[PDB]
Amino acid sequence: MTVAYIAIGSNLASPLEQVNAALKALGDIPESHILTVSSFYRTPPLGPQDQPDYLNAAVALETSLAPEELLNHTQRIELQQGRVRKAERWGPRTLDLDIMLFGNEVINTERLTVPHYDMKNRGFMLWPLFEIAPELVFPDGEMLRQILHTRAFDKLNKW
Numbered sequence: 001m002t003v004a005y006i007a008i009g010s011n012l013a014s015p016l017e018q019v020n021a022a023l024k025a026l027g028d029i030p031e032s033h034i035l036t037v038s039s040f041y042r043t044p045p046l047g048p049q050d051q052p053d054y055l056n057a058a059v060a061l062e063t064s065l066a067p068e069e070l071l072n073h074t075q076r077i078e079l080q081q082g083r084v085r086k087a088e089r090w091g092p093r094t095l096d097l098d099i100m101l102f103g104n105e106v107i108n109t110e111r112l113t114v115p116h117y118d119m120k121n122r123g124f125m126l127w128p129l130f131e132i133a134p135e136l137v138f139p140d141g142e143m144l145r146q147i148l149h150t151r152a153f154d155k156l157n158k159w
């Protein structure tokens with residue numbers, strides 16, 4: 001088994017409903033069990049700002065799936081919750097499931113890059129992650145606690 005950490009975001013079609021439904025669906029992924037769910041946070045949009053605020057959360061999922069098999073499931077769940085691809089970069093969406101970490105693994109395939117390429121620069125990923133895994137160490141040895149101690153991030157407000 002490995003513990004995967006997944007970032008959840010939603011800013012369309014009742015984000016609380018989307019995230020609750022996503023948590024049910026994540027539990028239903030085979031060879032996998034949810035260990036921990038963070039608080040829900042209401043966060044201002046980064047990137048384009050002409051969209052509603054996000055609900056952000058993090059989940060710890062213990063799994064014996066291959067990393068790309070986990071991605072298969074997270075993509076399925078997004079699509080089944082009505083996620084539609086628009087032309088605008090970083091536009092709003094009903095559900096976004098980003099695989100932040102897959103144990104200590106470094107993965108670089110055509111479909112999957114882990115650790116998530118920008119997570120160390122995103123408070124809306126790191127703060128919920130710290131809530132559920134304060135002892136976390138990244139594959140490169142960096143400590144989550146040290147990043148959050150050193151780098152300027154806005155505090156998150158709970159939903």
Ligand SMILES: Nc1ncnc2c1ncn2[C@@H]1O[C@H](COP(=O)(O)CP(=O)(O)OP(=O)(O)O)[C@@H](O)[C@H]1O
Nearest residue numbers: 090096097098099100110111112113114115116118
């Ligand atoms: N760690 C990861 N988690 C989820 N998807 C990933 C991933 N690494 C690569 N991908 C790939 O990323 C592709 C595009 O996903 P999108 O959701 O449109 C990017 P985004 O989440 O809007 O932006 P971001 O990656 O800057 O957060 C997916 O089809 C998937 O194949």
Ligand SMILES: Cc1ccccc1C(=O)CSc1nc2nc(N)[nH]c(=O)c2[nH]1
Nearest residue numbers: 009043044045046047054056090122124
């Ligand atoms: C941080 C950042 C810097 C520069 C350009 C883009 C971005 C995005 O994250 C864009 S996509 C995105 N932006 C987001 N904003 C919030 N609050 N929550 C999210 O889950 C979320 N996802």
Ligand SMILES: [Ca+2]
Nearest residue numbers: 027028029032
């Ligand atoms: Ca399961």
Ligand SMILES: [Ca+2]
Nearest residue numbers: 009096097098
């Ligand atoms: Ca994302």
Ligand SMILES: [Ca+2]
Nearest residue numbers: 096097098099
């Ligand atoms: Ca995504």
